[PDB]
């Protein structure tokens, strides 16, 4: 058996050309950042992970190295299940908060343990998880068309992503619902019925404006309505779902652990659970959430948006899961999606395949890592919701 010797958190920042910054309810993007988690062992088998973002990099680094890390040093990394609970009950729930950046931190470490396990076994993570369900590949969507566009421009951008091979894409909404509606109408007219259009309000709407928008989304045949409301308003989501439209009510990037999703399910408040393996507790926790969605006859389609590691970690699980595929793929300017690792976007008939190597299944460019150390740059401007 191996023993964990170090838990490291590398803070990384990559720039965004001013014109390529995009804004949603989450704020105006400034620099694409991440923590690259590195778990080392006595025999030199290493796993890597990411706790997603945007979350302050110093907060993440401290939580990972100095709160979670000490619970892992000296432990057999093979006992991922034991270690999840040791960390959650020993430190994170009480001492970082039960639905928190500490849970995202745990997630990054958990992903690294799964990567380590796959590397030790010389198997891709999806093989450990029972192998593929989606044997031919996983249907992806282009994430996302952001604010600050006219309707013709939104339609142009959608048509562009479709030309690149995407069969689905997402639109950010929430600031100016009349403009959002005009954008959606133009988008649908441009591409026709065979392209799925998803909408994401980043918690920007109140209940009544969300009900008004849902009518529009229904008219436009939208696939889902993501974060239509504050994630704190469970009943509001039930109200939207109770309208009985074919538009799925989706949320989950900002909800943590299976406990959050259980509360939504018990209140008939969710169609699509979007728990991200890199945020909601780890691969370990996302597995449980995906299963719980299926038990309730609901869907799990994770949020994946931060870096190529968060994408890859979720993709292993999605490939292995019988849930209908609607796999988030960040198409915005992001060096962490292109230059961090050897795994790249490749669409065939609208589908992507999980990485095929051991663990997460690709190689990290450590020269790139060394050249992009964080120097205190901000990731994102102030969010909305006031």
Ligand X SMILES: O=C(O)[C@@H](O)[C@H](O)[C@@H](O)C(=O)O
Residues in touch with ligand X (CB under 6 A): 24, 26, 143, 200, 202, 253, 303, 305, 328
Looking at the Cβ atoms of 110 and 253, the one nearer to ligand X is 253
Helix axes 308-320, 283-295, angle to 10 degrees: 40
Question: Tokens at residue 23, please?
Answer: 């804004």
The answer to whether 292 contacts its own copies (rule: CB under 8 A) is no
Looking at the Cβ atoms of 329 and 343, the one nearer to ligand X is 329
Looking at the Cβ atoms of 357 and 378, the one nearer to ligand X is 378
Furthest C-alpha separation in the chain: 60
Question: Tokens at residue 334, please?
Answer: 């992001």
29-88: contacts with Mg ion (CB under 5 A): 85
Distance, CA of 308 to CA of 360 (rounded, Å):
10
Question: Kind and range of the H or E element at 303?
Answer: none
The answer to whether 200 contacts Mg ion (rule: CB under 5 A) is yes
The answer to whether 94 contacts its own copies (rule: CB under 8 A) is yes
245-304: contacts with Mg ion (CB under 5 A): 253
239-258: contacts with its own copies (CB under 8 A): 254, 256-257
The answer to whether 110 contacts Mg ion (rule: CB under 5 A) is no
Give which of 369, 375, 382 is closest to 336, Cα–Cα. 369
Using CB positions, name the residue nearest to Mg ion. 85
Q: Measured from the CB of residue 66, what is the shortest distance to its own copies in angstroms? A: 7
Distance, CA of 329 to CA of 353 (rounded, Å):
12
The answer to whether 66 contacts its own copies (rule: CB under 8 A) is yes
Looking at the Cβ atoms of 115 and 200, the one nearer to Mg ion is 200
Buried b (16+ CB within 10 A) or exposed e, 184-210: bbbbbebbeeebbbbbbbbbbbebeeb
Task: Give, as one character, the DSSP assignment of residue 325.
Answer: P
**Selected binder of its own copies within 11, 26, 181, 247 (CB under 8 A):** 26
Relative to beta strand 138-145, strand 327-330 is: parallel
Give which of 259, 320, 257, 265 is closest to 110, Cα–Cα. 257
Distance, CA of 254 to CA of 270 (rounded, Å):
14
Q: Could you tell which of its own copies, Mg ion, ligand X, none binds residue 24, using a CB distance below 5 to 8 A set by kind? A: ligand X
Looking at the Cβ atoms of 188 and 303, the one nearer to ligand X is 303
152-181: contacts with its own copies (CB under 8 A): none
Q: Measured from the CB of residue 86, what is the shortest distance to ligand X in angstroms? A: 19
Q: How many CA atoms lie within 13 A of 141 on its CB side?
A: 25
Q: Could you tell which of its own copies, ligand X, Mg ion, none binds residue 3, using a CB distance below 5 to 8 A set by kind? A: none
Question: Tokens at residue 374, please?
Answer: 């964080």
Residues at the contact surface with its own copies, assessed by CB under 8 A: 26-27, 54-56, 58-59, 62-63, 66-67, 71, 85-86, 88-91, 93-104, 203, 231-235, 254, 256-257, 259, 263, 266, 380, 382-386
């Amino acid at each position: 058996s191996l023993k964990i010797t170090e838990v490291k958190a590398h803070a990384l920042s990559t720039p965004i050309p001013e014109r390529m910054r995009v804004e949603s309810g989450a704020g105006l993007k400034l620099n694409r950042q991440m923590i690259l988690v590195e778990v080392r062992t006595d025999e030199g088998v290493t796993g890597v992970g990411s706790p997603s973002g945007p979350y302050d990099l110093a907060v993440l680094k401290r939580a990972i190295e100095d709160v979670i890390g000490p619970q892992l040093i000296g432990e057999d990394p093979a006992n991922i299940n034991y270690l999840w609970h040791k960390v959650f009950h020993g430190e994170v729930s009480r001492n970082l908060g039960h639905r928190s950046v500490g849970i995202a931190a745990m997630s990054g470490v958990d992903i690294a343990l799964w990567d380590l396990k796959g590397r030790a076994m010389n198997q891709p993570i999806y093989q450990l998880l029972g192998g593929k369900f989606h044997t031919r590949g996983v249907r992806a969507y282009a994430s996302s068309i952001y604010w600050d566009l006219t309707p013709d421009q939104a339609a142009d951008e959608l048509a562009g992503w479709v030309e690149q091979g995407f069969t689905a894409a997402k639109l950010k909404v929430g600031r100016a619902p009349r403009k959002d509606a005009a954008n959606l109408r133009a988008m649908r007219q441009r591409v026709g019925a065979d392209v799925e259009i998803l909408v994401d309000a980043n918690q920007s709407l109140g209940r009544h404006d969300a009900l008004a928008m849902l009518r529009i989304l229904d008219e436009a045949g939208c696939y889902w309505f993501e974060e239509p409301l504050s994630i704190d308003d469970i009943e509001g989501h039930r109200i939207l779902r109770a309208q009985g439209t074919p538009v799925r009510i989706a949320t989950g990037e900002n909800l943590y652990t299976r406990n959050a999703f259980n509360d939504y399910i018990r209140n008939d408040a969710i169609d699509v659970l979007q728990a991200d393996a890199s945020r909601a507790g780890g691969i370990t926790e996302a597995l449980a959430i995906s299963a719980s969605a299926a038990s309730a006859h609901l869907a799990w389609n994770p949020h994946t948006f931060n870096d190529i590691i968060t994408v890859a970690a979720n993709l292993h699980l999605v490939a292995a899961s019988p849930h209908p595929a609607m796999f988030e793929w960040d198409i915005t300017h992001n060096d962490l999606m292109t230059r961090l690792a050897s795994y790249d976007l490749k669409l065939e008939n609208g589908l992507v395949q999980p990485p095929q190597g051991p663990g997460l299944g690709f190689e990290i460019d450590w020269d790139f890592v060394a050249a992009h150390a964080w120097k205190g740059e901000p990731a994102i401007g102030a969010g909305h919701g006031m």
